[PDB]
């Protein structure tokens, strides 16, 4: 049988954060992926 091989979920990770003089709350952005493997 023939099995297609695909490199599994990968992508970039960006952190959205305001200035350090305001708050330390952050948001993670996983690029070009679905919200399933994360």
């Amino acid at each position: 049988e023939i099995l297609d091989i695909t490199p599994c979920s990968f992508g970039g990770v960006s952190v959205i954060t305001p200035g350090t003089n305001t708050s330390n709350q952050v948001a993670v952005l996983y690029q070009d992926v679905n919200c399933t493997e994360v």
Binding site: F10, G12, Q31
Partner: peptide
């Protein structure tokens, strides 16, 4: 009229085509 998994990606533009049309 106008016409992968190796670490190379393309990021979508901030302004979508709908916003450019608007």
């Amino acid at each position: 009229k106008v016409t992968k998994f190796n670490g190379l990606t393309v990021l979508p533009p901030l302004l979508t085509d709908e916003m450019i049309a608007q």
